[PDB]
Write an enzyme that holds these catalytic residues in place. Structure first.
Site, PDB file in Angstrom:
ATOM      1  CB  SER A 167     -22.049  48.687-100.117  1.00 39.53           C
ATOM      2  OG  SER A 167     -22.222  47.904 -99.944  1.00 39.53           O
ATOM      3  CB  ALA A 169     -18.017  44.021-101.312  1.00 37.32           C
ATOM      4  CD  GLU A 279      -6.076  42.857-103.820  1.00 37.47           C
ATOM      5  OE1 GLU A 279      -4.998  43.435-103.687  1.00 37.47           O
ATOM      6  OE2 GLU A 279      -6.787  41.766-103.283  1.00 37.47           O
ATOM      7  CE  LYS A 388     -17.450  51.961 -94.507  1.00 36.06           C
ATOM      8  NZ  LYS A 388     -17.939  52.897 -95.692  1.00 36.06           N
TER       9      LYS A 388
HETATM   10  C1  LIG Z   1     -16.099  51.631-107.499  1.00 35.93           C
HETATM   11  C2  LIG Z   1     -15.619  50.404-106.233  1.00 35.93           C
HETATM   12  C3  LIG Z   1     -15.680  49.848-105.048  1.00 35.93           C
HETATM   13  C4  LIG Z   1     -14.635  48.692-104.657  1.00 35.93           C
HETATM   14  C5  LIG Z   1     -14.486  47.763-105.543  1.00 35.93           C
HETATM   15  C6  LIG Z   1     -14.523  47.851-107.005  1.00 35.93           C
HETATM   16  C7  LIG Z   1     -15.303  48.660-107.054  1.00 35.93           C
HETATM   17  C8  LIG Z   1     -15.566  48.351-109.226  1.00 35.93           C
HETATM   18  C9  LIG Z   1     -14.536  46.553-107.407  1.00 35.93           C
HETATM   19  C10 LIG Z   1     -15.083  44.815-107.325  1.00 35.93           C
HETATM   20  C11 LIG Z   1     -13.324  46.700-109.066  1.00 35.93           C
HETATM   21  C12 LIG Z   1     -13.140  45.697-106.539  1.00 35.93           C
HETATM   22  C13 LIG Z   1     -12.991  45.413-105.347  1.00 35.93           C
HETATM   23  N1  LIG Z   1     -13.470  46.906-105.302  1.00 35.93           N
HETATM   24  C14 LIG Z   1     -14.293  46.381-102.895  1.00 35.93           C
HETATM   25  C15 LIG Z   1     -14.367  47.629-102.577  1.00 35.93           C
HETATM   26  N2  LIG Z   1     -14.869  47.721-101.408  1.00 35.93           N
HETATM   27  C16 LIG Z   1     -15.104  46.551-100.550  1.00 35.93           C
HETATM   28  O1  LIG Z   1     -14.747  46.750 -99.085  1.00 35.93           O
HETATM   29  N3  LIG Z   1     -14.523  45.051-101.646  1.00 35.93           N
HETATM   30  C17 LIG Z   1     -14.401  44.904-102.275  1.00 35.93           C
HETATM   31  O2  LIG Z   1     -14.394  43.928-102.969  1.00 35.93           O
HETATM   32  N4  LIG Z   1     -15.303  48.536-102.986  1.00 35.93           N
HETATM   33  C18 LIG Z   1     -14.889  50.501-102.388  1.00 35.93           C
HETATM   34  C19 LIG Z   1     -16.616  50.098-101.653  1.00 35.93           C
HETATM   35  O3  LIG Z   1     -17.167  50.448-102.833  1.00 35.93           O
HETATM   36  C20 LIG Z   1     -16.294  51.538-101.103  1.00 35.93           C
HETATM   37  O4  LIG Z   1     -15.376  51.341 -99.863  1.00 35.93           O
HETATM   38  C21 LIG Z   1     -17.710  52.192-100.785  1.00 35.93           C
HETATM   39  O5  LIG Z   1     -17.780  52.976 -99.048  1.00 35.93           O
HETATM   40  C22 LIG Z   1     -18.272  50.809 -99.675  1.00 35.93           C
HETATM   41  O6  LIG Z   1     -19.771  50.871 -99.087  1.00 35.93           O
HETATM   42  P1  LIG Z   1     -20.120  51.567 -97.713  1.00 35.93           P
HETATM   43  O7  LIG Z   1     -19.386  52.446 -97.462  1.00 35.93           O
HETATM   44  O8  LIG Z   1     -21.835  51.123 -97.856  1.00 35.93           O
HETATM   45  O9  LIG Z   1     -19.930  49.947 -97.218  1.00 35.93           O
HETATM   46  O1  LIG Z   2     -10.544  44.194-104.784  1.00 28.86           O
HETATM   47  C1  LIG Z   2     -10.276  45.290-104.959  1.00 28.86           C
HETATM   48  O2  LIG Z   2      -9.055  45.105-105.902  1.00 28.86           O
HETATM   49  C2  LIG Z   2     -10.592  45.842-104.310  1.00 28.86           C
HETATM   50  F1  LIG Z   2      -9.820  47.358-104.646  1.00 28.86           F
HETATM   51  C3  LIG Z   2     -11.127  45.928-102.714  1.00 28.86           C
HETATM   52  C4  LIG Z   2     -11.662  47.134-101.846  1.00 28.86           C
HETATM   53  C5  LIG Z   2     -10.837  48.414-101.146  1.00 28.86           C
HETATM   54  C6  LIG Z   2     -12.005  49.943-101.212  1.00 28.86           C
HETATM   55  C7  LIG Z   2     -12.301  48.977-100.040  1.00 28.86           C
HETATM   56  C8  LIG Z   2     -11.584  47.478 -99.289  1.00 28.86           C
HETATM   57  C9  LIG Z   2     -12.095  46.735-100.881  1.00 28.86           C
HETATM   58  K   LIG Z   3     -21.591  53.112 -99.876  1.00 28.67           K
END
Ligand SMILES: Cc1cc2c3c(c1C)C(C)(C)CC=[N+]3c1c([nH]c(=O)[nH]c1=O)N2C[C@H](O)[C@H](O)[C@H](O)COP(=O)(O)O
Ligand SMILES: O=C(O)/C(F)=C/c1ccccc1
Ligand SMILES: [K+]
Ligand SMILES: Cc1cc2c3c(c1C)C(C)(C)CC=[N+]3c1c([nH]c(=O)[nH]c1=O)N2C[C@H](O)[C@H](O)[C@H](O)COP(=O)(O)O
Ligand SMILES: O=C(O)/C(F)=C/c1ccccc1
Ligand SMILES: [K+]
Ligand SMILES: [K+]
Ligand SMILES: [K+]
Ligand SMILES: [Mn+2]
Ligand SMILES: [Mn+2]
Lengths: 500, 500
Positions: A167, A169, A279, A388
């Site tokens: 994933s 994050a 964000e 979710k």
């Molecule tokens: C594409 C993308 C997905 C981000 C993301 C970003 C991008 C570029 C960022 C890095 C630029 C900014 C933050 N993001 C977070 C994020 N999810 C999360 O839990 N925390 C994050 O901080 N996500 C979304 C997360 O990847 C999706 O919710 C997935 O479903 C998580 O995988 P999982 O279902 O296996 O938990």
């Molecule tokens: O850091 C962020 O701007 C962001 F999108 C976090 C996030 C996205 C999807 C689910 C959870 C957290």
């Molecule tokens: K995933």
């Protein structure tokens, strides 16, 4: 290696597509790289490859911005996403989402272990690297740290070994050998972290791989089901087993062609300052630092001439929109269908800042259900907002078959003209809310609960006897022969290309 | 005569602007003229002038479509509206709306009576015309009649003579010498009709003038206050007294250069089938005919080579959007300010199908009020939704000073990210509703009541200490010097004109 299986080949593909600008003069990772990338994303320009980053040394690192952002032309608007998946660059969003869902009723194809790969070309032990000395970008002027991690894949495994999650994050540099980042419910990295914390015996073995196979970073961004190992889902989707190599300091496996790998541990006990960060919804709240999860880095391995992908996220349009929103919508579509709801299509309009999902209804099927708006909205909202896959989404808009949910203008038309405020909506206050939306975490109510709605843009006869209007538009308000005459005589009369 | 004072000069202006296509070959008023115009409006093309209309005789009539629709370029997007008002063609929407509001704190300039004008060049008495023989357009394939009246001005006067109203309301041909049309509360044509009905002595003296001075048709489309004679408001706005000529068969006065004038009576007793019509929200409900008001035509006068303006209304973008929405928003802005509300700007986003108005708040003033969202939304909604200027509008969106309400993308961003569904909204069920919106007249609740909402997209600190975020965008997330560097090096690096 094919582009969808190898990030270095993906970069080549972008070049070949005339979708890349190579910048070979020095560029500062302190704001400049991200500012250029931000402008790209706001204008749908070519992806920037920063080959001469100020502070690049030990061969760490070049930057590719805007890896999953939009192209300017309509015909290949989603081409960068199509290049993650071996699809033609003209692929539609429906085709991209169908490809991402395709593995959901296939047997997994588990990964293949190989003895080495490009990711092992160089290494730095814990006496040889300092994260604070690397050219990690400051992405937004008010960010609370240098966000190394915006487009890599975190790898953690359940204590019993049976689920390995991939994933995205976010994470930022804390000190020479630690990161801090967001690890929040209901995300899988959080769910696995909780399993290790309840066991209470050790920190979570972890790796973070940057520049992974493009098809893998797409699955990393999608809410595939609990307990499903992304590597096998990606193998089924692509029709090939992914090639992985063991970490040096732990027993996790990373893609053989990863550009850069960090190996270490995610603490079950420690935290450190994290954020603020600009964000996905378009904001930063300067000074809003909170305690986040803390990662310790024990080892770095990397390719020669390693490239770090970066998302300069914020206002439209970047990876947080194209990938987070669309991939959640895809999973919602499937969820609805598996719950016997007559949903054909789903998409998160960009105009909503990907906080809405529009659900296209098969209204023939709806009619056979012999139901009402109140009942049907409640059903749809309970399925989606209790799952979710619905986490990030605060408004669901139900639309009939005439609406193309992938076209925001048509969604906004239907919402504004077919859904009576209040009466045709159902509010959900007892569901998990997405705190990152400003009206949630910085709003008037509980950050983590409620604030969700189902908006029914189905008209009354769509539940009973069928659509009872025609649009007052060129397409629907004039007969075929007339339309064609007008079109054929258009430029002859004096009035004003697909690819563009 | 200047373009803003004379429709024939306006047509010349459009030609000179390279904003007109003259079609000199035969065009059918049965759907073809309107289909061409519909396509114009959906593509922001040049206005069509139909000089050779099938069925044109007695010199009645040519058609100009899309008189108040949009131009393609951003720089002169509102140029056709600017040409109604003597403004430069690059005028902004703020400048157009300010011009339309300018007369509200000026003395009226009453009209000047002249003995004759171009509108008297030709005449047809009640033995010489047949409305069913004229080239009246069928505008949408499912319309319930041929809508002669889509861009003329109805003229009626109160029984006591003290208020003469000019307004646009649709009307269609009923038979050789009658029209039917919409006359509904709270519109001024309805309010005056009710005065005559309570008097009970005669039918309402009436005229319908087509191709009037452009500045007059704009005021005709604006909800200026009850009891205010549009002619004097237009005189104040333009700085000149309008020249009017007496009707031949009644004592009403029409603009001297009107293209075509119908004289007769609006019945206080009779009705006839009216509609359906493809309407401003984008729909027609085939077969939905209802009883409307009935007009009797006693006389026609007209210019040589008379031109009938036509709105082929429906989906975006036409006069029903550019004029109905924007001009209501302008009046709402003023209303708010007169009620001591700290509103700087108002606009009806086109994306909302002009069912929303975004209200820009002076948040310094708001802070001094020491109020809350709940209280302030209620105040704003009571002022606007209890007034005729709010009639057409079902959602008000409150936004702070960083939002340009004339830019729909920014309104949608603010709505989607700053207004928590339910909690940050107040519903209004005990106000007049607009039945023409499909979710009203063809929806699940009362057609004429409720369905309104105030959506507060102000963030909490906007009421207390001030904005506490920065946007995650190029403009706000990077220092001035950096931004300018990036811009200056943009095309040098490899990345991609105002007028366009
Ligand atoms: C594409 C993308 C997905 C981000 C993301 C970003 C991008 C570029 C960022 C890095 C630029 C900014 C933050 N993001 C977070 C994020 N999810 C999360 O839990 N925390 C994050 O901080 N996500 C979304 C997360 O990847 C999706 O919710 C997935 O479903 C998580 O995988 P999982 O279902 O296996 O938990
Ligand atoms: O850091 C962020 O701007 C962001 F999108 C976090 C996030 C996205 C999807 C689910 C959870 C957290
Ligand atoms: K995933
Ligand atoms: C620009 C414009 C305004 C239409 C209009 C159209 C256009 C082109 C049409 C003709 C294409 C379709 C229908 N329209 C009606 C209409 N108002 C109304 O009461 N009935 C109508 O049938 N209006 C709006 C009406 O002109 C405004 O509400 C005015 O404020 C009415 O003037 P008043 O304030 O003096 O009553
Ligand atoms: O006929 C119509 O499409 C229309 F917009 C009518 C209307 C507009 C504003 C106020 C009242 C009626
Ligand atoms: K509805
Ligand atoms: K008026
Ligand atoms: K709010
Ligand atoms: Mn997962
Ligand atoms: Mn009036």
């Amino acid at each position: 290696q094919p582009a969808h299986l190898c990030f270095r080949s993906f970069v080549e593909a972008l070049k070949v597509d005339n979708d890349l600008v190579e910048i070979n003069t020095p560029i500062d990772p302190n704001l400049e790289a991200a500012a250029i990338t931000r402008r790209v994303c706001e204008t749908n320009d070519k992806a920037p490859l920063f080959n001469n980053l100020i502070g690049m040394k030990n061969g760490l690192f070049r930057i590719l911005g805007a890896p999953g952002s939009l192209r300017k032309s309509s015909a290949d608007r989603y081409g960068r996403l199509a290049r993650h998946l071996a699809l033609p660059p003209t692929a539609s969003m429906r085709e991209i989402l169908d490809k991402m869902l395709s593995a959901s009723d296939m047997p997994p194809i588990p990964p293949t272990i190989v003895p080495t790969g490009p990711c092992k070309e160089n290494s730095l032990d814990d006496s040889e690297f300092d994260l604070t000395e690397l050219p990690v970008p400051l992405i937004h002027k008010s960010d609370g740290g240098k966000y190394i991690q915006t487009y890599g894949m975190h790898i953690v495994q359940s204590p019993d070994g049976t689920w390995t999650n991939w994933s995205i994050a976010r994470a930022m540099v804390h000190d020479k050998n630690h990161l801090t980042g967001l690890v929040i419910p209901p995300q899988h990295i959080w769910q696995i972290h909780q399993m290790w914390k309840k066991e209470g015996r050790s920190d979570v073995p972890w790796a973070l791989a940057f520049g992974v196979p493009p098809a893998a970073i797409m699955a990393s961004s999608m809410p595939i089901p609990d307990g499903v190992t992304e590597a096998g889902y990606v193998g089924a989707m692509t029709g090939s087993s992914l090639e992985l190599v063991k970490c040096d300091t732990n027993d996790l496996y990373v893609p053989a062609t990863s550009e850069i790998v960090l190996e270490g541990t995610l603490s079950i006990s420690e935290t450190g300052p994290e954020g603020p960060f600009g964000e996905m919804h378009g904001y930063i709240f300067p000074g809003d630092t909170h305690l986040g999860a803390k990662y310790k880095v024990n080892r770095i391995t990397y390719r020669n001439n390693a490239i770090m992908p970066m998302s300069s996220c914020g206002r439209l349009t970047d990876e947080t929109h194209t990938m987070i929103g669309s991939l959640a919508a895809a999973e919602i579509r499937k969820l609805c269908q598996q719950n016997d709801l007559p949903i054909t299509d789903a998409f998160a309009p960009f105009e909503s800042q990907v906080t809405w999902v529009a659900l296209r209804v098969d209204t023939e099927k709806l009619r056979a259900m012999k139901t009402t708006s109140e009942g049907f909205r409640k059903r749809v909202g309970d399925v989606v907002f209790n799952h979710k896959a619905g986490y990030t989404i605060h408004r669901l808009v139900l639309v009939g078959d005439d609406i193309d949910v992938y076209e925001g203008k048509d969604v906004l038309w239907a919402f504004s003209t077919r859904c009576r405020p209040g009466m045709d909506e159902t509010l959900f206050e007892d569901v998990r809310g997405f705190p990152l939306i400003p009206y949630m975490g910085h709003g008037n109510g509980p950050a983590h609960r409620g604030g969700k709605v189902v908006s029914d843009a189905l008209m009354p006869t769509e539940y009973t006897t069928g659509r009872n209007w025609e649009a007052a538009d060129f397409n629907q308000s004039y007969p075929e022969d007339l339309k064609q005459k007008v079109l054929d005589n258009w430029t002859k009369m004096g009035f004003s290309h697909h690819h563009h």
